[PDB]
Amino acid sequence: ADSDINIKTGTTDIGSNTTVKTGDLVTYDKENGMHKKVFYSFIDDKNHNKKLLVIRTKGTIAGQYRVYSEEGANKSGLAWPSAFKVQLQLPDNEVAQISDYYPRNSIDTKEYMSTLTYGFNGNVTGDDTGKIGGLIGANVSIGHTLKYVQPDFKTILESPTDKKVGWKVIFNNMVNQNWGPYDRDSWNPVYGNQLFMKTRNGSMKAADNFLDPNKASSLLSSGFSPDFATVITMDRKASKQQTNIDVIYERVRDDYQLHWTSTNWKGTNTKDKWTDRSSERYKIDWEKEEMTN
Amino acid sequence: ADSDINIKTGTTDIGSNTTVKTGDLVTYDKENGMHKKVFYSFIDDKNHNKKLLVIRTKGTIAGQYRVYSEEGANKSGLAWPSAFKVQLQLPDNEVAQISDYYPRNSIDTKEYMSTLTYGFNGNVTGDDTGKIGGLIGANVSIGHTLKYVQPDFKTILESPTDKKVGWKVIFNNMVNQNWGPYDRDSWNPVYGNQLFMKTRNGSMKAADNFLDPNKASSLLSSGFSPDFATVITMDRKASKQQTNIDVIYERVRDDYQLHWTSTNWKGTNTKDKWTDRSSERYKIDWEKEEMTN
Amino acid sequence: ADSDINIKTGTTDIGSNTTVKTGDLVTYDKENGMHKKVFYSFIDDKNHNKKLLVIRTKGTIAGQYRVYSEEGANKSGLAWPSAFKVQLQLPDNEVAQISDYYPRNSIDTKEYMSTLTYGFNGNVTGDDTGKIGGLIGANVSIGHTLKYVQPDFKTILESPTDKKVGWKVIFNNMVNQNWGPYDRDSWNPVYGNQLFMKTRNGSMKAADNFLDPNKASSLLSSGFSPDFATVITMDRKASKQQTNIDVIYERVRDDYQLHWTSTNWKGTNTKDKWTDRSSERYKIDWEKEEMTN
Amino acid sequence: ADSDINIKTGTTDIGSNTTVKTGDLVTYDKENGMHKKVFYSFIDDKNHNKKLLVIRTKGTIAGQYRVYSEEGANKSGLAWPSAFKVQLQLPDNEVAQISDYYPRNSIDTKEYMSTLTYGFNGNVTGDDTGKIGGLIGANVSIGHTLKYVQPDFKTILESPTDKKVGWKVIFNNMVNQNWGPYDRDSWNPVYGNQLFMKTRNGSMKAADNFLDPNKASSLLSSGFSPDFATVITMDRKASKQQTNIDVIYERVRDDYQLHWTSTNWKGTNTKDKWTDRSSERYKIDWEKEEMTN
Amino acid sequence: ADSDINIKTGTTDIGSNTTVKTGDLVTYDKENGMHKKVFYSFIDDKNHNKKLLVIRTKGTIAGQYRVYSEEGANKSGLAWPSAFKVQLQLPDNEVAQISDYYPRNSIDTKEYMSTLTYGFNGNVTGDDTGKIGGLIGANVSIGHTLKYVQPDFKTILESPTDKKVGWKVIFNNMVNQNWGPYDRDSWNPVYGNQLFMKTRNGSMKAADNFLDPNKASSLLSSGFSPDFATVITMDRKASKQQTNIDVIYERVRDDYQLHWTSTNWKGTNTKDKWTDRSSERYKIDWEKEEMTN
Amino acid sequence: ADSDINIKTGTTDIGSNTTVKTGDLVTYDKENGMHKKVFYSFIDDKNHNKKLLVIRTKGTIAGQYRVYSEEGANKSGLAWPSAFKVQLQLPDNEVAQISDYYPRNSIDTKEYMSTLTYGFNGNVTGDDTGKIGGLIGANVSIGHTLKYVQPDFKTILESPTDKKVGWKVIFNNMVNQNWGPYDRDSWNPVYGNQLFMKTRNGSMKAADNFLDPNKASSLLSSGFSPDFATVITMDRKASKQQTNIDVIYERVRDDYQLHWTSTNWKGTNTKDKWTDRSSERYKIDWEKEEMTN
Ligand SMILES: CCCCCCCCCC(=O)OC[C@H](COP(=O)(O)OCC[N+](C)(C)C)OC(=O)CCCCCCCCC
Numbered sequence A, B, C, D, E, F: 001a002d003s004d005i006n007i008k009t010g011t012t013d014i015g016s017n018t019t020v021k022t023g024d025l026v027t028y029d030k031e032n033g034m035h036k037k038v039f040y041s042f043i044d045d046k047n048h049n050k051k052l053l054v055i056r057t058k059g060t061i062a063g064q065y066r067v068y069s070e071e072g073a074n075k076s077g078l079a080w081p082s083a084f085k086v087q088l089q090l091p092d093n094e095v096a097q098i099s100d101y102y103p104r105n106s107i108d109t110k111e112y113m114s115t116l117t118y119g120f121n122g123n124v125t126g127d128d129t130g131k132i133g134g135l136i137g138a139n140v141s142i143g144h145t146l147k148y149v150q151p152d153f154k155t156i157l158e159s160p161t162d163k164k165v166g167w168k169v170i171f172n173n174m175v176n177q178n179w180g181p182y183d184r185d186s187w188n189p190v191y192g193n194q195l196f197m198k199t200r201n202g203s204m205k206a207a208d209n210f211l212d213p214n215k216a217s218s219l220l221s222s223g224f225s226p227d228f229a230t231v232i233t234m235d236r237k238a239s240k241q242q243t244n245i246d247v248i249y250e251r252v253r254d255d256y257q258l259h260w261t262s263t264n265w266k267g268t269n270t271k272d273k274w275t276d277r278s279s280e281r282y283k284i285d286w287e288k289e290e291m292t293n
């Protein structure tokens, strides 16, 4: 908070009394279903030290959640998106540098609660025959309760070097049919990984017996639309005013297969089966303030 | 957050010191009961890279929740809106492209809570006859609690290609008569799908025995009014300054039938029975900045 | 959110650098107790496409909650407002159209919580005679908890056509004497519909035995004041610049009668007994920007 | 709160009607994986008393979470970041001084709840033989509940002297596999420190049996990006207008080793095993208002 | 709230259309580890009645939490900061006065909840021999629950006279090892004051057996940074325009000693053992609007 | 809310385009420890109807919590502030009037919750000898829960007449040693009023056995600083432009005495023992817009 040091709010920011030449580039990769788009902005504030360029890789990545293979009613497969990734890179010999990037790793908290209870009890028992009985008792109780919030997909910021910065979205865990949350490594000796399992012992065809995409999380089927910001600074006295950038939109899928053993379905997951990458190279012209490709 | 990179807030946005020519077009489709409307705005900022056009498909889609067929008191049917859809498409040969779209798939979270309890107990029992008894005990308890919020209708963003983008609204599940939430695939061996069932074993006429539309969710009967935004960019040097768009407002209904077997009502649901589509083609004139049709 | 597409906030709105000629018309209908009022505003922004007119039907509708008929102490009646309605309509041959309307159907959510508990137990029992006993036990528990918020009166938006748009307020359910919520269709074999019942088996006069209006919801007795907004657009090249509108403020009452059978009171409800409508026709003059009548 | 003393808000702040010359310097230390960056701003308000300079050490520090050594399946090690540190220092003979620093130690609160319950009980027991029995009882209960929120990593502000100021981020405790929170000093006689333990008695290779980095907290693997602000004031009449600063980005790792004793895995932690420091010296030129190096 | 009297918000404040000459003075007291700093501002609004001066004693006070003395493994001591204080004073003969001071005593609230429960019970017992038994029971329960939030350190405003005003921060109570909150006066017959005790009956060296500073509250080890505001008014017609102020940063430490009696550790606390004061005298020159020393 | 009537926000307020001459007067009453201060503002808006003057009686009142008398170890007393009061009055013959006053009586709410539970139970018992037993049971439960928040000190606004207006702060109730809240009228047959009691049956000296001021609420010891606003209007055509005001800062103390009967301490409270008043008379000069004294 800038106002917490007594500095008037907004004084230290950059971009006042200047003209910013924004832009936009959109490209669709039919092969991988990645509607990538980048929205840039050239800021050159005279009071600043270096020329600036903010790249916002909005785009969108499809889900690709479908049953790829079926072999009769005995067994069938399924491919689902294990994690989405997007990164920006620069040539090793380039002179520009990565300055900032908004979505960053943040610390996570958890509640905690301790309970202690003392008790006392006493009753008097009697019957018709005149018998009289008594009972005196006591009890103690100690309790620990711990609660926290865990999302289905967890965004991460990979260690950003000077030249390349990249994010990542992975599959934390999911709740199926209102049952206990499952994850890729979850295992049960009888049924196995029940992640995307419709019925434990249904009699339908194996390919049919898969969780309906609507029931599952949206990102699995309808894709994930990133919103990431990075800022690139280039010295104003550099001999060359042209730079090249590479943007990647890789998506990683997994193989989930359920198998009918004798009576019930058995689910197995094979992480990191396929990976799809869609890299496009853009060219930056600092002098003209336009990025084209 | 633009201010989190130290850039002055609002610097990177587009639309400053420019005149935007808005508009409006309203049309009602009596056949399907879809009061469709589009509210557009032409933004051509000199500091930007391409001409812009934002389309907000506000409109409204009716519910169409009524008992379509009745056959005596033995059985009767009912049609309800399973899902609402709206999408924008462009001709394959067009040069414009889809840039953005507001309502997007978002990650969902869930609470979690683990509990552990230790116990101790002891009592002394005595009677008139002088008998003295004792009791010492202990117990342990482990508990997992998981809570999350699930809406009745869940909006989704279908995988947006470069040329076409479309949303979708589906029926998650509903609570009937304060009873457990039901959904399309819910089944009970005795009664069956009790989704829109008034009384389990009422003696009234079959057509009468249906959940009152007021009790159910509003969207089922009174319709759903969308609010979706998309932005279309067209290069300023293109030879042709005219483009055509298509807007669709399809709505999908289901068939719900309850049947009197011997004593109680039995309910069955047949998903995706009917679909109603209302597509209108608009023409865009970038040079004059007006969309008409 | 306009700022979520990178457009500067407020750019796409209409009404900048223009003069709006507001107005006001108030009329009271003594027969039906409806203090109806409309607050209009003519907006004609040169950058827009059509002339605009926003109508805000503020007004107010009385409750009319009273004991209409009494027949000795054996039985008596009561009329209460089941639902309030207000709608705007245009002549079929008119050229203007309905564009927007603020209060719209919204999706409703519900919480959900699943619980699972394991237990263990063991005690050692002994007495004076040296007898020693043991006990080992275990238990499991499964719990589903579902919570949601339900208001007394639920506003709805009837399917809006091009020419007419109307809202509606209905009676969801009410809590009486801190007892379980009741509604119009609620029934109990012994007492019946106990909605507005003071005492189950009081000995007072039948007319007296009714819930005090203060205890009940406010809208029942003191009326409901609507706040609804609609916008009408008319093409700027139309031959005729005059339009007629109709505004209706209908209110629906129900008959609630309690009857002394032998020992306790019995309550019965007869929905949709009376309806009161108060329609006034206004005239719109686009050229002069004034609505009068 | 400035407005709480009746002073108009923002009156006492500094930075109005002045030009601030910002800047930026980025450097990457390949050896230690620390993408350090500093964003400075020279403020010289004529109404103020001294020249000002705010340094925001944004940067980023990698996680470095990996299995460094493995010796067959009997045992293997692991190094994880115990704490991240960053500090600014000035030469002892310098004339500038440290004025402020935003992230500061803050007081922490805890909930508290006391419960007291009285009880009464009575039952009548009878059998076919005509025997009649009674039971009267009472009980009391006292309960203390205390709850508070404890984050995984806890930022601290080391005692700031006049010349040097430094922050610190340490490892509070973590929740593993939904089990009770663990910390560095946690110990269990059977298993030991179960902090980063995959399975208690799994049969896999020792190196394999480690908690997946995705499951653990993000900062452990993907690094921690600091955001700390400090302000340096230098008198405007000083003979020398040049100052030197030192910025350090030390990171401390620990050694976590699990050992297979006879049947189950045993985990041991050795705090403060390695420390990595990356110090860079910057030069400040007050007269020209530029920091370079 | 100024707007609650119908006065336009901000009308009654002071500081509009005037120039405020701020300042800053920083000094570090190596002997006591108190990085004291004062940030002043001279406001002389022509519409006001007196000259104004707001002093914000930001500064910072070190924690000084360490084991001062150890005598073998039998016993050892510890000194921790019991309370931090800071006050401003004026000479008795001075003419200026204290007007305001932000952080002020505030009323504290507590929740409350009363519970009442009625019960009923009945079971039918039978065996093979045809014996039939019954049981009818009832019970009542009354419960009072009271919850409130209590911070570790509680800031107070000492009774402010005309000439001197001073704040105070004291040690409310702390939670150790997730156990019941402890305070200075807490006592246990077996162990004693268990405030900063690592293990109840550990076998390590006495000096070693102390709570790790990281586990404890931050203010204990890393110090407390105050933020207090006071405003001084001086008449504009006074003969002398020079005033002297004194600022004190006293810190009070306590002695905590744990002692090995025969088997377990015993902890004893001796409140108010040492006090450290660091007073500096500043000179105020109203005519020149500068405070120097 | 002004914007809820369609009036542009802030239109109806007073104070626009005018100059307000503020002020300040501070006086300390050594005898009673009341640092009283008044902050006035003369507003004369030409569009208004009367001259305005807002008086904000900020000031501060000391706590005066101490053991006044002790008589050996058998008994001792204590005086604590029961209630703080501040009021403004005008001479009866004056022409000015009291218009407004911010802190006003506000309605207080309470939660409420009704619970109902049905149960069922059944078990099968068997032993080695082949005996088989059964048990079928049921139970019902009704519960009322009511929760609300009650502060320690409750501010009130005494009935404001035309000439005088006064506030009041009283002692609602307090929580001692985490035990049930106590108040002035609380009584216990064995111990008595245990409000400020350290230990029930401690053996220390009577004067020593009193609750530590730090443990109690802050206002008891460190005093209460009021913040109250009132506005006085005087007609602009009045013959006399001078008015006199009286400001009072009375504080009421109570006598709390604990007495050693035979084994335990007994506490008694005598409400309204002493009262301290400090009234100062100010003179208002409307023509010159200055209040002096
Ligand atoms: C895997 C299990 C590892 C052992 C964990 C030990 C830490 C938990 C301590 C514990 O049980 O809580 C403390 C309780 C409650 O009493 P306290 O709060 O200590 O008050 C003393 C009253 N008392 C003498 C009648 C017992 O007092 C006790 O009963 C404590 C007795 C000494 C420690 C052993 C307790 C066994 C707990 C499983």
Ligand SMILES: CCCCCCCCCC(=O)OC[C@H](COP(=O)(O)OCC[N+](C)(C)C)OC(=O)CCCCCCCCC
Binding pocket: B142
């Ligand atoms: C479908 C069921 C699959 C098995 C799930 C195992 C995971 C749950 C572990 C569990 O029951 O919780 C741990 C408990 C509580 O004690 P801990 O927290 O382990 O402390 C040890 C104290 N104790 C030796 C007296 C037991 O200690 C135990 O009693 C654990 C014993 C070893 C695991 C088997 C527990 C059976 C749970 C159904």
Ligand SMILES: CCCCCCCCCC(=O)OC[C@H](COP(=O)(O)OCC[N+](C)(C)C)OC(=O)CCCCCCCCC
Binding pocket: C142
């Ligand atoms: C109207 C009632 C329709 C039936 C509803 C079935 C769905 C509910 C399943 C259920 O009861 O929850 C699962 C429980 C808990 O254990 P799980 O979480 O399955 O862990 C297995 C441990 N166990 C073998 C010792 C039981 O394990 C069981 O006991 C499940 C046994 C198989 C399903 C039948 C359960 C009967 C529930 C009324």
Ligand SMILES: CCCCCCCCCC(=O)OC[C@H](COP(=O)(O)OCC[N+](C)(C)C)OC(=O)CCCCCCCCC
Binding pocket: D142
């Ligand atoms: C490690 C344990 C140290 C001792 C802690 C003592 C402090 C806790 C006091 C306590 O147990 O709570 C007070 C209860 C509840 O009654 P009160 O609220 O005192 O009302 C009196 C009614 N009664 C005479 C029928 C009992 O009344 C009592 O039963 C209090 C009796 C005197 C104190 C001893 C209680 C033993 C608690 C472990």
Ligand SMILES: CCCCCCCCCC(=O)OC[C@H](COP(=O)(O)OCC[N+](C)(C)C)OC(=O)CCCCCCCCC
Binding pocket: E142
């Ligand atoms: C240290 C203890 C001091 C005594 C505290 C007395 C204040 C608490 C009163 C109390 O126990 O709550 C009221 C209950 C519940 O019934 P009520 O709400 O009074 O309804 C009457 C129904 N009844 C006749 C069947 C009892 O009705 C009763 O059982 C109240 C009977 C009269 C007061 C004595 C109750 C004993 C409480 C410890």
Ligand SMILES: CCCCCCCCCC(=O)OC[C@H](COP(=O)(O)OCC[N+](C)(C)C)OC(=O)CCCCCCCCC
Binding pocket: F142
């Ligand atoms: C100081 C006490 C004054 C009396 C307060 C009466 C008001 C409370 C009524 C009450 O107990 O709650 C109603 C319950 C629950 O059943 P309901 O919700 O009435 O459903 C009827 C089912 N049942 C016939 C099997 C009982 O049904 C009953 O058991 C009600 C029976 C008639 C009223 C007497 C109940 C006694 C309560 C202390």
